Design a protein around this motif. Structure first.
Motif: not given
Length: 129
Positions: A4-7, A27-31, A123-129
């Motif tokens: 999943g994106r956030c995952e 960048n990494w998640v978009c790639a 790409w990482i917005r809304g993610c509890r990182l």
């Protein structure tokens, strides 16, 4: 495994990719998104005969050995199948070597054509990182 994106972002952060070499996490998640669609088992064969493996589509002519790419340098010294694992440590570790290469993330065609110069932070917005 299909992430999943956030995952995937949390997994890459924990593996030390956020701002590794100046490239923020987005960048990494978009790639990953445009290279493998977040699927760790993705493989893509190229016209030159080499094949791209994994979440980050690492190439067999230079970075990994798949036993079928002649003149493979295998710079990350690892069999390409190791990169299709649910655990992204090998992909991330080899990617670090690739990104430190002097060409940066431009080495990934999908990053260059679809992520570079965009609001990658989306790409990482809304993610509890």
């Amino acid at each position: 495994k299909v992430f999943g994106r956030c995952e995937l972002a949390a997994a890459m952060k924990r593996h030390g990719l956020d701002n590794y070499r100046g490239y923020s996490l987005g960048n990494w998640v978009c790639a990953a998104k445009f290279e493998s669609n977040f699927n760790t088992q993705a493989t893509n064969r190229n016209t030159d005969g080499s094949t791209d493996y994994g979440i980050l589509q690492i190439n067999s002519r230079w970075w990994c050995n798949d036993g079928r790419t002649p003149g493979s340098r295998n710079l990350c010294n690892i069999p390409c199948s190791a990169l299709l694992s649910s655990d992204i440590t090998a992909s991330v570790n080899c990617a670090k070597k690739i990104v430190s290469d002097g060409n940066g993330m431009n080495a990934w065609v999908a990053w260059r054509n679809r992520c570079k110069g965009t609001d990658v932070q989306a790409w990482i917005r809304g993610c509890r990182l």
